[PDB]
Design a protein around this ligand. Structure first.
Ligand SMILES: */C=C\C(=O)Nc1cccc(Oc2nc(Nc3cc(C)[nH]n3)cc(N3CCN(C)CC3)n2)c1
Length: 254
């Protein structure tokens, strides 16, 4: 493969995190290109062909690999990290509804491409979205309980579809509109399981327009196939402030 690279071409400069499966680093590639490098611990496992052939402006791009152990994965670099941390921290404070809805439109657009390609994400949530400069957001972490973000069919009967991802997108919309709070505040996993089965849904977060909550509630319909597509979600969010909320005026937090 042309994607396979020499081990000397990667400088691992800054350790970013460490999870169960390995590490993540900001680095350089061929001395010129900024990159993110994920490291698989040897023993953990032994798909990037898929990821080579998943190209979209709003999906973190695979750039290069090292396929014999120890494995290194080279990727597009998203400077600001986690969408969840970005929402909670010093940048949360200034984001208003137009920035957040535009962000949601990006992630919709990445998820619309995943939809066209007949793939399933399975863990769509603010923790698995990466942010770059100028509030660019991209879907990441396709190849790996978050029951609060997981549709009932999926959590209960392992029925994971693009429509279970739509459900998670409604949940993500609440994360954006609350600056990253955990959904169902004060509820534990079983409390949530039990309540959403009985018809309970998160209410309109403070300052969030009702037209948006409405969209969230379409995403949380009992029947997977009654939920909208990502092509619909994207288009609605893109056109939001002309077609749906033309009289939006700034508030204290949204
Ligand atoms: C929400 C939890 C979470 O994801 N935290 C987190 C902890 C440690 C490391 C990371 O990865 C990480 N990645 C990037 N950029 C990246 C990864 C890939 C793949 N492509 N691009 C950036 C960052 N950060 C940079 C910004 N700082 C302020 C914090 C970490 N972290 C995620």
């Amino acid at each position: 493969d042309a994607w396979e690279i020499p081990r000397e071409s990667l400088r691992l400069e800054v350790k970013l995190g460490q999870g169960c499966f390995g590490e993540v680093w900001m680095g350089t590639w061929n001395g010129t290109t900024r990159v993110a490098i994920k490291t698989l611990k040897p023993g953990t496992m032994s798909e990037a062909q898929v990821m080579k052939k998943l190209r979209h402006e709003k999906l973190v791009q695979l750039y290069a690999v090292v396929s014999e152990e120890p494995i290194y994965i080279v990727m597009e670099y998203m400077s600001k990290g986690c969408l969840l941390d970005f929402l909670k921290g010093e940048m949360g404070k200034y984001l208003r509804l137009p920035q957040l809805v535009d962000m949601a439109a990006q992630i919709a657009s990445g998820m619309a491409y995943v939809e066209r390609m007949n793939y399933v994400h399975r863990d769509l949530r603010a923790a698995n979205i990466l942010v770059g400069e100028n509030l660019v957001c991209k879907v990441a972490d396709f190849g790996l309980f978050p029951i609060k973000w997981t549709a009932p069919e999926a959590a209960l009967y392992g029925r994971f579809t693009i429509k279970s991802d739509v459900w998670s997108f409604g949940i993500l919309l609440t994360e954006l509109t609350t600056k990253g709070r955990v959904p169902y505040p004060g509820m534990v996993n079983r409390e949530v399981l039990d309540q959403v089965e009985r018809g309970y849904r998160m209410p309109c977060p403070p300052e969030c327009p009702e037209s948006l909550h409405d969209l969230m509630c379409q995403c949380w319909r009992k029947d997977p196939e009654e939920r909208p597509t990502f092509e619909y979600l994207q288009a609605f969010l893109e056109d939001y402030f002309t077609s749906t909320e033309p009289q939006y005026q700034p508030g204290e937090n949204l």
